[PDB]
Design an enzyme around this catalytic site. Structure first.
Site, PDB file in Angstrom:
ATOM      1  N   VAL A  29       0.985  -1.128  -0.087  1.00 40.28           N
ATOM      2  CA  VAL A  29      -0.097  -0.071   0.057  1.00 40.28           C
ATOM      3  C   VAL A  29       0.751   1.392   0.060  1.00 40.28           C
ATOM      4  O   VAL A  29       1.998   1.045   0.628  1.00 40.28           O
ATOM      5  CB  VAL A  29      -0.849   0.002   1.315  1.00 40.28           C
ATOM      6  CG1 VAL A  29      -1.735   1.354   1.097  1.00 40.28           C
ATOM      7  CG2 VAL A  29      -1.954  -1.325   1.043  1.00 40.28           C
ATOM      8  N   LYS A  48      -3.436   0.196  -3.132  1.00 36.76           N
ATOM      9  CA  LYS A  48      -2.685  -1.172  -3.199  1.00 36.76           C
ATOM     10  C   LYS A  48      -2.294  -1.789  -4.329  1.00 36.76           C
ATOM     11  O   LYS A  48      -3.179  -1.806  -5.288  1.00 36.76           O
ATOM     12  CB  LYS A  48      -3.661  -2.095  -2.305  1.00 36.76           C
ATOM     13  CG  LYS A  48      -3.352  -3.604  -2.565  1.00 36.76           C
ATOM     14  CD  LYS A  48      -4.089  -4.420  -1.419  1.00 36.76           C
ATOM     15  CE  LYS A  48      -3.384  -5.980  -1.462  1.00 36.76           C
ATOM     16  NZ  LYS A  48      -4.304  -6.867  -0.777  1.00 36.76           N
ATOM     17  N   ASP A 142      -8.289 -12.701   8.792  1.00 40.27           N
ATOM     18  CA  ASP A 142      -6.924 -11.931   9.290  1.00 40.27           C
ATOM     19  C   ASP A 142      -7.166 -10.832  10.162  1.00 40.27           C
ATOM     20  O   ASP A 142      -6.275  -9.846  10.248  1.00 40.27           O
ATOM     21  CB  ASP A 142      -6.187 -11.507   7.838  1.00 40.27           C
ATOM     22  CG  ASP A 142      -4.750 -11.312   8.136  1.00 40.27           C
ATOM     23  OD1 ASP A 142      -4.376 -11.770   9.055  1.00 40.27           O
ATOM     24  OD2 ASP A 142      -4.080 -10.792   7.160  1.00 40.27           O
TER      25      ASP A 142
HETATM   26  C1  LIG Z   1       0.189   0.731   7.218  1.00 39.79           C
HETATM   27  C2  LIG Z   1      -1.118   0.912   6.378  1.00 39.79           C
HETATM   28  N1  LIG Z   1      -1.276   2.199   6.289  1.00 39.79           N
HETATM   29  C3  LIG Z   1      -0.233   3.107   7.044  1.00 39.79           C
HETATM   30  N2  LIG Z   1      -1.018   4.522   6.620  1.00 39.79           N
HETATM   31  C4  LIG Z   1      -2.116   4.214   5.803  1.00 39.79           C
HETATM   32  C5  LIG Z   1      -3.006   5.163   5.497  1.00 39.79           C
HETATM   33  N3  LIG Z   1      -3.986   4.696   4.564  1.00 39.79           N
HETATM   34  C6  LIG Z   1      -4.402   3.535   4.411  1.00 39.79           C
HETATM   35  N4  LIG Z   1      -5.379   2.729   3.966  1.00 39.79           N
HETATM   36  C7  LIG Z   1      -5.230   1.507   3.853  1.00 39.79           C
HETATM   37  C8  LIG Z   1      -4.095   1.304   4.481  1.00 39.79           C
HETATM   38  C9  LIG Z   1      -3.479   2.550   4.784  1.00 39.79           C
HETATM   39  C10 LIG Z   1      -2.374   2.844   5.636  1.00 39.79           C
HETATM   40  C11 LIG Z   1      -1.022   0.179   4.948  1.00 39.79           C
HETATM   41  C12 LIG Z   1      -0.833  -1.238   4.970  1.00 39.79           C
HETATM   42  N5  LIG Z   1      -1.940  -1.912   5.789  1.00 39.79           N
HETATM   43  S1  LIG Z   1      -2.839  -3.257   5.228  1.00 39.79           S
HETATM   44  C13 LIG Z   1      -4.418  -3.004   5.919  1.00 39.79           C
HETATM   45  O1  LIG Z   1      -2.851  -3.016   3.799  1.00 39.79           O
HETATM   46  O2  LIG Z   1      -2.224  -4.422   6.041  1.00 39.79           O
HETATM   47  C14 LIG Z   1      -2.122  -1.316   7.116  1.00 39.79           C
HETATM   48  C15 LIG Z   1      -2.255   0.205   7.016  1.00 39.79           C
END
Ligand SMILES: CC1(n2cnc3cnc4[nH]ccc4c32)CCN(S(C)(=O)=O)CC1
Length: 298
Positions: A29, A48, A142
């Protein structure tokens, strides 16, 4: 000449990478800006993309996208659209950007803003998100603080539906035999032993999330560290799984976090019931949590 009848299609040329945010189920992401007017008045989004992609993974990614799109709830991360990148020969998922990131990270970095009332507020919100998920017969698979997002102080949202399954209409469990690494320290016993996932197994995992919340992500107190400590830090490979199973099957459990009220530990304990059908529902849980919160306020 131009007509936009699909605001869920994001234009590749206007989607500009800003920063990397974090890994998620078989992917990554990143923080991006969508600025179709080039005037820098656009919005920041989370995007993503798959890592080490394949035909199978892409099909799974497509199912995750449709799952996410089907969901509309205050405690579920917002789907915004798709981007058909690589001149429309690739797929990316556009999501809302939540500035405070994962709940795990937020609990570690902002302990000064966190108390028990807040922890319960989040617990409640996660349950309600999960209630919503069950109405669509989605099994998340998960649940964990790393996969929960924080919008602000007062609101968290369930994320990463990368492993999520839909119950096949006539059944109450989904059997998924899968290669590679599973998050075993959040799995119900029947998920470890039989590969069986259900609403009940998500309730088990929620119990581990509740544990996580009341350990404040202290380090050494995480489910992996605790389980490994109980199992023996020497253990490697499959032996880890063997002992975890044996441990869980005979009532071995994560300990009550220090400072955690007996009543909250009781909730964890009830979620961690080897009898799948004796576990409480997410509706039971939200009501009980909100009643605790309502009864405390004085
Ligand atoms: C760290 C994270 N993240 C950090 N800052 C973010 C800001 N916005 C986000 N939207 C989706 C995830 C996300 C963010 C991105 C990765 N994930 S996940 C759910 O894909 O495992 C947790 C959240």
């Amino acid at each position: 000449a131009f007509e936009d009848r699909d605001p869920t299609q994001f234009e590749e040329r206007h989607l500009k990478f800003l920063q990397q945010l974090g890994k998620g189920n078989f992917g990554s992401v990143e923080m991006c800006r969508y600025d179709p007017l080039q005037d820098n008045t656009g919005e920041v989004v989370a995007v993503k993309k798959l890592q080490h992609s394949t035909e199978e993974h892409l099909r799974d990614f497509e199912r995750e996208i449709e799952i996410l799109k089907s969901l509309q709830h205050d405690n579920i991360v917002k789907y915004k659209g798709v981007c058909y990148s690589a001149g429309r020969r690739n797929l990316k998922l556009i999501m809302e950007y939540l500035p405070y990131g994962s709940l795990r990270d937020y609990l570690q970095k902002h302990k000064e803003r966190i108390d028990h009332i807040k922890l319960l507020q989040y617990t409640s919100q996660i349950c309600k998100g999960m209630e919503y998920l069950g109405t669509k017969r989605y099994i998340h698979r998960d649940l964990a603080t790393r996969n929960i997002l924080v919008e602000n102080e007062n609101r968290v949202k369930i994320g990463d539906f990368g492993l999520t399954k839909v119950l096949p209409q006539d059944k109450e469990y989904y059997k998924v035999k899968e290669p590679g690494e599973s998050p075993i320290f959040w799995y119900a016993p029947e998920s470890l032993t039989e590969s069986k996932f259900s609403v009940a197994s998500d309730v088990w995992s929620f119990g581990v999330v509740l544990y996580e919340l009341f350990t404040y992500i202290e380090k050494s107190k995480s489910p992996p560290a605790e389980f490994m400590r109980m199992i023996g830090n020497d253990k490697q490979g499959q032996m880890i799984v063997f002992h975890l199973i044996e441990l869980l099957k005979n009532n071995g459990r994560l300990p009550r976090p220090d400072g955690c009220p007996d009543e909250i530990y009781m909730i964890m304990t009830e979620c961690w019931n080897n009898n799948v059908n004796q576990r409480p529902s997410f509706r039971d849980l939200a009501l009980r949590v909100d009643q605790i919160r309502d009864n405390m306020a004085g």
